[PDB]
Each structure stands twice: as structure tokens, then as C-alpha cells.
Design a protein around this ligand. Sequence first.
Ligand SMILES: *C(/C=C\CCCCC)=C1/C(=O)C=C[C@@H]1C/C=C\CCCC(=O)O
Ligand SMILES: *C(/C=C\CCCCC)=C1\C(=O)C=C[C@@H]1C/C=C\CCCC(=O)O
Lengths: 263, 274
Amino acid sequence: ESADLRALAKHLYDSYIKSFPLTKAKARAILTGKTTDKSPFVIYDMNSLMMGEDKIKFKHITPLQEQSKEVAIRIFQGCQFRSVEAVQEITEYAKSIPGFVNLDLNDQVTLLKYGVHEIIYTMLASLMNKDGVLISEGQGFMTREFLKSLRKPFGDFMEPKFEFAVKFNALELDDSDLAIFIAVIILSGDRPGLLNVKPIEDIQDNLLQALELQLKLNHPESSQLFAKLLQKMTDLRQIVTEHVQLLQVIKKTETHPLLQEIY
Amino acid sequence: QLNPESADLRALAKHLYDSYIKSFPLTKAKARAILTGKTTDKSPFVIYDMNSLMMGEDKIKFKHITPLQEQSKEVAIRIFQGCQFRSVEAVQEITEYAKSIPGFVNLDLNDQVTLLKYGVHEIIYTMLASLMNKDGVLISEGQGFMTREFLKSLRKPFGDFMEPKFEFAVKFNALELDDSDLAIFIAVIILSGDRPGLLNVKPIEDIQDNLLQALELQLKLNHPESSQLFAKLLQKMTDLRQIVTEHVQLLQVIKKTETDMSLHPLLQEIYKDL
Ligand SMILES: *C(/C=C\CCCCC)=C1/C(=O)C=C[C@@H]1C/C=C\CCCC(=O)O
Ligand SMILES: *C(/C=C\CCCCC)=C1\C(=O)C=C[C@@H]1C/C=C\CCCC(=O)O
């Protein structure tokens, strides 16, 4: 049924673009030249960040008064706001994956709950390079060295992912490939608390076929790509528990009685 | 049917299965023939308590897995000293298995040592799975069987080193893999490239790309019904990591709780900034 897989690939790609504003393609051009011609505001140091707040006016996160008086905190604060946006973008895409909405409600919640981080890192890679990462709509670009520049637990917190980004992007996958790759991550049957694994596994099984095919056609040239891709999930889990430990440390910091609530 | 290029890969599969057998005494075929009690000559002595723990050392072979030492007042540790030496032995075998992997000895010496460094544990847990069933694991090479419940009780930290294993084992054994499969898979594992500090990474990838192809053909030929087993097996590699990680974690605590216990240079050198 290799007529079914190619149609399931298109559907997911179609849905991936509707649910996600900044594609991997759009993101790439901006890290190179066909910037539309409208280049991104490079945040390279303190004064570039400060000035950043009003030019790119990512004053969605930065608004809130009583707090924003210690730079790196206002930035982490940022990474959180956008992550919350993304999680609703992921949830929506998810609901586009055939069979998902038909699963036991709890499991949908459960698969989403345990799979959004793996998916946020995966796409964060679509938007970063060895030296930097696109922020807010693609308007900005925060430097890698400026990130290590942050002090306390912040200094290195992003550096883990930069290393993961390089390796992952070396695979040179495009959105066409990522849409399917993301459907697989969600349909993971080893998520704790699941109640009906058979359905989920069957779905991922059909997704893994559609991906294997996608990769063969999209990259005849590259051998065993499918295999190196599945192997990356090992990095992702490992990267996701670590980030989960730094959270632990920042919780040796002081960071409203309705903000932490949402998050 | 079998195109020239594919036939070239079957050769590889048969060469590793051959080197695998020749390097590992207790294969999965033997281990299952023991665990599934299809025998009256291959019956293991079960250890599910101190009593039989005492019975076991008397009954089954034991040229001191736990070397020179009078009964170090605690079983949970005796088991561990033995469960330690046993691993150093596996790295030995695994190291010999590697050498047979085509192109592996032809690599920068420094890289060989690193491919193992990271690959040795992911492999020990893969194979240890062959010696397990939901209820326990074989010891002494089939001669004994230590029940999963006895272990889980050992004590304070010591009763926590084995759950992850049984946890993986039952899920991994679920794939129903056989020796000729494991041999190729374990070769892939060693031949990573995604391993840290690997000086020359390219050559590693060219060898793995091959091992991965061999595994792909093998699994399809050996499991015509197993839909996407190739993939399902590759994902299991992530479980392999959490197990290793979590272990390292447990070991450090243990490196503080028990001041008189000894690791092993080799075991420590793997963990040495792992
Ligand atoms: C931000 C930090 C924490 C996320 C919340 C954790 C819950 C326990 C993350 C980080 O540093 C790595 C990924 C995210 C970044 C946020 C958005 C990425 C944008 C990718 C896109 O949608 O194109
Ligand atoms: C050894 C206990 C029993 C194995 C019996 C079979 C012999 C034929 C266990 C095991 O397999 C899982 C953990 C431990 C050995 C593994 C690593 C040694 C120390 C490194 C560490 O994880 O701390």
C-alpha cells in the first residue's frame, strides 16, 4: 500500500505547515540570505538584548511589570512563554495525525504530556545553527556565545542543545521529513500511564513506514538515514532529562501570583 | 531475488553471528533452553532467599566470583562484588567480539577505546536480557537462577540495581530476538560515531551504515511477519541509555554509602567522565 504512505506523508506535511508558523525552510533562508531581504535583529550582547525588547518588541513575554529587573531571568521567562505557544501548536498538529483523536482521551493527554519536549527540541533545531538561534517569529537571532555569556545556571543551559542541534541538522531533514518524524514521537507507546498501547503502536507503525519511505525518496542519496534519525531519539530523551534537572537547580533561585500558575 | 549487493551483506551477518558464538559462551539459545526447563540435565539451582543463598554457594560452581574475602558480612554486597567481576569479564568478551567487526581494528587506536567505553554497557544490558525472564536471571552461566524478588530486597541501595534491567528485559525480550539478530545489533551499538570525543568519526559511520544494512536485511529475512522490527529495535537503544545513565547514578551514591567497597579500575575508567 505504498500509495497510502505517500498520501499520509502529504497530509501530515500539509498539517505541519498550518500548525507551525516558522517552517524549517523559512528558518533556513533567514540563517543565510533570502531573508525576504528583511534581516533579523541580532541580539549579541546586553545592549543588543535591551534594545531587542523594543525593536522586535517581543513584549508579549517581556511585558509583566513587578519582576523584569534581572536580564537572564527575563530571557528564561521568555523561553517559557514561547514554549507555551508551541505546546498548543503541537497539540493542534497532533490532532491532525490520523487515529489520534480516536484514542482514549486520557492517552491523548498522556502522549502529548510526555512528548512535547522531545518535539520542542527537535524543532528548536530547525531554528538554530552552530552560532545562533532565531527568536520571536524569526525576527530576531540570539547568539550562541551570548547565551553562555549568561551567568548562574543560565550560562550553560542552551549549550547542551546547540550541540544537539548541530548533530541533528547534519541529517539535513526538511519539513516534509519532520512532519512525519514528529508524528512518530507523539505516537510513542512507552509513555508511562498509557491505557491502550495497541492502537498507539499500530499508528506509530504506519507512521514509521511513511517516514522510511519519505526518507528513501527525499534522499535516495543518503543511505540508512531512517536509521540514524531513529537513533537521534536517544539524544533527545537524554537531553530532555538533563534540562529537567537544571530546572531543579534554577529552583535555588527566586522567580507574579498568577504567572507560575499558568506555567 | 538475492541481488549481488544483498548477498554481500548476508556474508557479513553470518560472519558476525559466527564471531558472536565464538566469543560468548552463554548464547541466548542456550539460556532459553535452560530457563524454559526443557531439560533434566540443564536445571538451574534457584536462589530466592538467604537459605538457598547459602544452598547455592554450596551447590553451584563458585571459584570466588567475589575474590579473596571471607563472607563480607553482607549478602547484598557479596552478590555485588560477584556481579562486578562478572562484568569485567563481559567487557573482555565484548572486546574480543569487537575485534572481529570488519574495519574495527583498522581504526585509530584512541577511537577503538572510546567506541567500547560507551558501547560496553549498552551491550551488557542487551545481552543480560537474554539471561532474564519476568521472574529472574541466570548466574554462573546457566547453573543458577536468582529470583527477581530476592534481588529487589537485597537492601538500601543494593535492592535497586536490578529493577531497570528486568524492566527493559521483559520489553526487549518481547521483540523475540535471536542470537544471529543480536550479533548484528550489538555490532551497530559499538560502531556509534555519536560517541563523544571520537577523533575520526567518518570511518565509524561508514562501517555502521553497513552494520545497519546487515541488520535491516537480517531482521526482514528472520522475521517476515515482524512489522517494522528494524525500527522498533533501534528505538530500544534509548532504553539502553537510561539504564546505563541511571546505573552511573546509583554507583556514585554507593561510592559514598559504603566506604569499604571497591569498584574496579576498568569499571571506573568506563564511568570516568562518562
Ligand atoms: C524553553 C525552556 C523550557 C520549556 C518548558 C519546560 C517544561 C518542563 C525550551 C528550550 O530551551 C528548549 C526548547 C524550548 C524553547 C522554546 C521554543 C522553541 C521554538 C521552536 C519552534 O516552535 O519553532
Ligand atoms: C550483575 C548481576 C547479575 C548478572 C548475572 C549473570 C552472569 C552470567 C548486574 C547486571 O547484569 C546488571 C548490573 C550488574 C553488572 C553491570 C555493571 C557493573 C557495574 C557498573 C554499574 O552499573 O555500576
